[PDB]
From Swiss-Prot, chains A, B:
It comes from Severe acute respiratory syndrome coronavirus 2 (2019-nCoV). Residues 64-189 form the AV-Nsp11N/CoV-Nsp15M domain. Likely affects Nsp15 binding to RNA. Uracil binds at K291, C292, V293, C294, S295, T342, F343, Y344, P345, K346. This is Uridylate-specific endoribonuclease nsp15. The active site is at H236 (proton donor), H251 (proton acceptor), K291 (for uridylate-specific endoribonuclease nsp15 activity). Residues 206-345 form the NendoU domain.
Amino acid sequence: HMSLENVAFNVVNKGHFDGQQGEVPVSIINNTVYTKVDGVDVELFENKTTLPVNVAFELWAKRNIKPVPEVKILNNLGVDIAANTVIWDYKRDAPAHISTIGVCSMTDIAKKPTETICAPLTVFFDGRVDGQVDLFRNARNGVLITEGSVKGLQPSVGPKQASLNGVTLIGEAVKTQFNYYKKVDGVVQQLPETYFTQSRNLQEFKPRSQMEIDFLELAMDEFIERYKLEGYAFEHIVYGDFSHSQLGGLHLLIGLAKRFKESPFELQDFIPMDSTVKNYFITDAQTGSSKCVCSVIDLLLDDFVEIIKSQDLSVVSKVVKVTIDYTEISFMLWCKDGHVETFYPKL
Amino acid sequence: HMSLENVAFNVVNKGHFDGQQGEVPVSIINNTVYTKVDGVDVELFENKTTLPVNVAFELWAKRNIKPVPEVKILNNLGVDIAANTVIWDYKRDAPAHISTIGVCSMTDIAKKPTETICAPLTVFFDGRVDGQVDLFRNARNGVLITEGSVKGLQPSVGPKQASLNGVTLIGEAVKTQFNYYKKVDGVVQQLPETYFTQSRNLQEFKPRSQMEIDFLELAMDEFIERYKLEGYAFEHIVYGDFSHSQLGGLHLLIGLAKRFKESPFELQDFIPMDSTVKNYFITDAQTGSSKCVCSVIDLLLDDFVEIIKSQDLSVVSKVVKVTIDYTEISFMLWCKDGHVETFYPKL
């Protein structure tokens, strides 16, 4: 019973594909799907993907509408495909994964995740659905999330925030903190201690600690004096230097959020995807200071302090590996006479 | 149960829409409809119409596959729409009529031809289908075809040839000669005495009379002598004059067919539709003689002789009306000292 006209019927009456029977008339013209309502044509969907318009439309209609992990997490853990669902990437207006399992006949490589073809792929399993936990046992490579514990397996506690219909949030009407589990070539693996990025916007930026509130409210000199941060180059690294043509430092998102209230500036996101580290092309409207590639990360300031304070300030240059969002980020550390010059994410 | 995937299923298994249940996967990319067969994508339809790709695809799939009248006839009689079918125009690779009655939800203006919306339109009715003759009786404006007689109604005998899946032919396994009837504002109308064009090609041209066979086989002077055509300017009108830069005359298709065997030339069909009269841009490869607008018609030579023989050669200029394919064509006749100079279809 699967058809274009049926998919559209569901979208019109329910907002997403809900397995309802019915049809409505449809027009396809130039990567857009229209339908007729009271004699006039109405835009339902504009294809921004590399898939065919009608295939993309169907995958969108069947997108997951419960809280799910942010795509950067799933990428960091090496997830190749999802089991009997679709993770819509709202930053690319596209599917997170281009192949499917038991969802859409045009994109399916299999009907069930146990088929031989799936063995070499790392499959995503949602423990909230019935039968998925057992499929995760029996699977050769995979990733599993659950709300509660699963006896037999050691959990890793994930981040507090998740994505719900494109909105990243910390749920209180719904649970957004998951237990993570992973398997490689038939063997369960221990996940390392990790920090997590906070996934915040620049315009609707909110603090999440007393230190963050102090940072936003206080002046520069006062903040450094309290919390005793002399020699750690917060002037350069967090606050940022706008005195020369080349913009200096400015690698923590909170730093941008402070500057933005006082004096708006221009960001170009020339690689628009979800990442643990982001690169922006930044031009400061007040000064005319700019930089082509500016590496930015959103750590809780408290955690950034913890990371920098636990380093050796004796060496001139050093690469520092740190586990964030379940992956190794490299940082470059420069010191001079026992204080820091700079400390930034490597390219 | 109307759907894209179902329409395609029928096309794949039956060649046209035959009301079968089933689905196959489909892709839409750039005005083309594809389907997957043994893992690979296959072109089913390329849209050359002004309709949306999926709408056009459906109308094509539901095209009429019995012998039907050539579009030029239907146009000449003033048919605006067809009742519960689709007449595909194979010269335009498009529908003959852009609106429908009980065929496709996107293009339908009504479900039945008796609805009030249909009253001002001239509807086509096919007497071979059950109930159509009665619908023709109740209709305000319409055209009807039948194989046999219909009690009460005076018939007009149509042409011998009809179109079958794009092929124009005189049927012997099937009947292609119809009785025609027409109504205007509730009143049956008498259709006039008419000639019919022969609908022949230039490359596969075949004669249909002894006179036509003689024309092709014999030399010019001999043909004019035998059928006594002195003073009727067949040298100019039919055979054509290639001695000057501007090509002279050449208005009968048989004339082209004779020339083409001896010495091929170039036609440009700059308005590609079916018409009783055609205009071509012609360049003669042998001489370099040419003409921008060359009006051509395909009458049976016998009929052309009959028409020209029954004229008054006393006037210098005269417009001559002649009924061909149920419509009035004007001809321009020039005479000088009791013989003809030229005689051609008016522009």
